[PDB]
Amino acid sequence: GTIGSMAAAPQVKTQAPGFYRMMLGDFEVTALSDGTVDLPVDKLLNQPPAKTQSALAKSFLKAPLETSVNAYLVNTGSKLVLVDTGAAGLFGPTLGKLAANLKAAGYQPEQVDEIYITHMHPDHVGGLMANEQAAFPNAVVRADQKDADFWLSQANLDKAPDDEKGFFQGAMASLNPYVKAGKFKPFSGNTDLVPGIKALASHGHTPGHTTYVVESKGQKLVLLGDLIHVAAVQFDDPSVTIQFDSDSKAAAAERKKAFADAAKGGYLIGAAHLSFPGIGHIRADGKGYRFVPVNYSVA
Ligand SMILES: [Mg+2]
Ligand SMILES: [Zn+2]
Numbered sequence: 001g002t003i004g005s006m007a008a009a010p011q012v013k014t015q016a017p018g019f020y021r022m023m024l025g026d027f028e029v030t031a032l033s034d035g036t037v038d039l040p041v042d043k044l045l046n047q048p049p050a051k052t053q054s055a056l057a058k059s060f061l062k063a064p065l066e067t068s069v070n071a072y073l074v075n076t077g078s079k080l081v082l083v084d085t086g087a088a089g090l091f092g093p094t095l096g097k098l099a100a101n102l103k104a105a106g107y108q109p110e111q112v113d114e115i116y117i118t119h120m121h122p123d124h125v126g127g128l129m130a131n132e133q134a135a136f137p138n139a140v141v142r143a144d145q146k147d148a149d150f151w152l153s154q155a156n157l158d159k160a161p162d163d164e165k166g167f168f169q170g171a172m173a174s175l176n177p178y179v180k181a182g183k184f185k186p187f188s189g190n191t192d193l194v195p196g197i198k199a200l201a202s203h204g205h206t207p208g209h210t211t212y213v214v215e216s217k218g219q220k221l222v223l224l225g226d227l228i229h230v231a232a233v234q235f236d237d238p239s240v241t242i243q244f245d246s247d248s249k250a251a252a253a254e255r256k257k258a259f260a261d262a263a264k265g266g267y268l269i270g271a272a273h274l275s276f277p278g279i280g281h282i283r284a285d286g287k288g289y290r291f292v293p294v295n296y297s298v299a
């Protein structure tokens with residue numbers, strides 16, 4: 001090149017901050033990404049790999065599938081509440097981004113009033129704890145009593161097979177600061193939590209798996225937790241379950257109920273493992289369902 005020609009600019013590669021703002025009536029919703037993680041869904045889904053492979057190909061995907069891990073912040077005006085918290089470092093080095101994305105979204109952990117846990121798998125409770133301390137120093141954490149009593153019981157850890165013991169260890173370590181400080185407040189099934197947010201039992205994926213129903217000024221968003229893991233399989237065929245389910249029959253029943261109710265009601269859903277931000281509508285589509293992601297909107 002000519003004298004002092006500059007080298008070609010290197011690729012930057014880093015992703016944009018993983019948060020997405022959406023108004024819901026008077027409430028401000030911020031989808032928060034914890035990162036993604038590859039899942040061997042051909043092996044984990046409870047059907048023959050060839051059927052999964054064919055379904056993935058139809059959506060231009062292949063296993064291992066990069067799967068989003070999402071949480072949802074809701075500012076109701078009177079309360080700042082966080083639904084799920086990501087994995088922290090419990091599920092590998094690609095997750096644990098929630099804390100940075102919360103900061104990029106303009107909030108600090110000390111501002112969070114209440115945290116609602118859909119279920120105590122590591123990629124939903126790991127974000128509660130850092131350095132054996134509560135990462136959210138003012139928050140009250142709530143989850144179903146059945147989930148608490150299953151995952152936070154020493155007997156169930158000691159009965160669990162070796163490759164499942166970490167789920168109980170991680171849940172206990174994640175909840176312990178709050179339990180010790182008197183800031184873990186269970187509920188039992190369908191419960192009003194704060195004005196505008198209710199717990200709706202959706203048991204199956206875990207014994208206390210809970211859906212959170214957010215409503216303001218007639219605008220409803222139903223946060224489904226882990227009622228779905230693999231959009232490219234489970235919207236066309238909601239009967240396909242996954243090894244991560246504690247009770248796969250109940251999990252399939254709860255997913256079918258939620259999809260049918262959302263199709264009938266025409267309201268928004270948000271789900272922890274739909275491609276970030278994981279927010280959209282559902283319409284019936286023959287024997288299955290079609291997801292309609294929200295339109296990109298800027299205030
Ligand atoms: Mg990758
Ligand atoms: Zn889960």
Ligand SMILES: [Zn+2]
Nearest residue numbers: 121123226272
């Ligand atoms: Zn999950």
